[PDB]
Amino acid sequence: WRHACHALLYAPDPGMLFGRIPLRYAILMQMRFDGRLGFPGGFVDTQDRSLEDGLNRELREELGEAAAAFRVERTDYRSSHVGSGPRVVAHFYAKRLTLEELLAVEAGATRAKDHGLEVLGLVRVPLYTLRDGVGGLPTFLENSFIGSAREQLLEALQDLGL
Amino acid sequence: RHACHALLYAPDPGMLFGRIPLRYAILMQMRFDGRLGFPGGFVDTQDRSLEDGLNRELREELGEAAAAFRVERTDYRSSHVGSGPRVVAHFYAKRLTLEELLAVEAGATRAKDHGLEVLGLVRVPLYTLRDGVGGLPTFLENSFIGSAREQLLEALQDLGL
Ligand SMILES: Cc1cc2nc3c(=O)[nH]c(=O)nc-3n(C[C@H](O)[C@H](O)[C@H](O)COP(=O)(O)OP(=O)(O)OC[C@H]3O[C@@H](n4cnc5c(N)ncnc54)[C@H](O)[C@@H]3O)c2cc1C
Ligand SMILES: Nc1ncnc2c1ncn2[C@@H]1O[C@H](COP(=O)(O)O)[C@@H](O)[C@H]1O
Ligand SMILES: [Mn+2]
Ligand SMILES: [Mn+2]
Ligand SMILES: [Mn+2]
Ligand SMILES: [Mn+2]
């Protein structure tokens, strides 16, 4: 029928926000064209050869030529949530990159086919909670998310410690 | 103590999905605190003008692309005080070319604050989808810092919608 694939792209960061709050990882979510946060990717169309073939296709389109300097494999797979109402099964993948690899995506993402149409920009995910106990991750989640993207995210943070 | 933030925007001829007109590209950013806000920060002692600490904080946050244009008093829009923090927040709107803006977006990843104070830049969606909730109505649901949303919502009426 209609399968959709989206990727979390994550690179470990030794950097320290304010020089004391440790970042731990760079994680890329995108601001979509509906004003909801989510992940790179989307529909697997009819003449795609595999789930994963179709994903790397959408990463290129949404992220740019730099997304092509790696490939999400079957092995990067995490989950599949069935969207019942809009009859669509939605597959998730998490790809470990170098911070050099992940920065090359962000720097190239403004030349992406879909930059400034489907993809309004890329945002890193703040993992820290700030002293006030609310600024950071807790607030980041208060934002608006398309379909299961908040679950996907929280499962990814969970799965790998956090 | 005073703060300054800029709205940067460009005539965008583009059509989303080849029909929906984008009108203007408008830069906001995803902040270190997980809120949407505008590039800028606290002005201090040596900054001769409000515009000096502003343009200075745009250099830090948007990279050496904002060293092409300069915001001045002519761009001023509002001063909203935040009672609790005691601070007076000042707002501007700077008109650029789509090419000037693309060049900020593209450059902002080599800025001092990329992956620290600044988590990413987003274009605001000025349109509304057929469900009448997709786009701006949905966008404004997001978290924003202090008077960030009011500033946006006031500039849009004053030119952009
Ligand atoms: C001319 C034209 C007009 C269009 N008008 C509209 C419109 O008005 N409204 C509209 O919604 N779409 C519209 N689209 C289609 C749009 O480009 C999307 O492909 C479509 O809305 C469904 O995909 P998506 O935006 O949800 O994200 P896609 O990346 O295309 O993903 C497809 C599916 O995955 C889901 N999804 C998206 N991001 C995530 C994520 N991070 N995690 C999990 N699941 C995710 C979506 O809910 C959808 O079910 C239009 C397309 C064209 C060509
Ligand atoms: N976009 C914004 N609009 C208005 N006030 C803001 C905005 N971003 C931050 N602030 C506030 O202005 C001060 C300076 O913020 P900052 O730029 O993060 O140093 C803080 O007291 C914030 O509460
Ligand atoms: Mn798509
Ligand atoms: Mn997509
Ligand atoms: Mn789940
Ligand atoms: Mn600032």
Residue numbers in the entry:
A (entry chain A): 19 to 180
B (entry chain C): 20 to 180
What does the literature reporting this entry say, word for word?
The Nucleoside diphosphate linked to another moiety, X (Nudix) superfamily of proteins constitute pyrophosphohydrolases of substrates that include (d)NTPs, nucleotide sugars, capped (m7Gppp and Gppp) RNAs and dinucleotide coenzymes including NAD, FAD, dephosphoCoA (dpCoA) and their derivatives. Among the Nudix proteins, Nudt16 is the most promiscuous. Similar to DXO, it can hydrolyze RNAs harboring an m7G cap, unmethylated cap, NAD cap, dpCoA cap and FAD cap on the 5′end. To understand the molecular mechanism for the recognition of FAD-capped RNA by Nudt16, we determined the crystal structure of human Nudt16 in complex with FAD at 2.7 Å resolution and the structure of free human Nudt16 at 2.3 Å resolution.
FAD is bound in the active site of Nudt16. An entire FAD molecule is observed in the active site of one monomer, while only AMP is observed in the active site of the other monomer, likely due to hydrolysis during crystallization and consistent with the deFADding activity of Nudt16. In this binding mode, the 3′ hydroxyl group of the ribose is exposed to the solvent, and the first few nucleotides of the RNA body could have interactions with the loop containing residues 101–106. The adenine base of FAD is π-stacked with the side chain of His24 on one face and positioned against Ile164 on the other. The N1 atom of adenine is hydrogen-bonded to the side chain of Gln170, and the N6 atom is located near the main-chain amide nitrogen of Phe57. The α phosphate is coordinated to a Mn2+ ion in the active site and has hydrogen-bonding interactions with His24. The β phosphate is involved in ionic interactions with the side chain of Arg50. The flavin ring is π-stacked against the side chain of Phe36, from the other monomer of the dimer, while the other face of the flavin ring is exposed to solvent. The side chain of Arg38, also from the other monomer, has hydrogen-bonding interaction with the N5 atom of the flavin ring. The AMP portion of FAD is bound at a location generally similar to that of equivalent moiety in other compounds, such as the m7GpppA cap, inosine monophosphate (IMP) and ADP-ribose, suggesting that the deFADding activity shares the same catalytic mechanism as these other reactions.
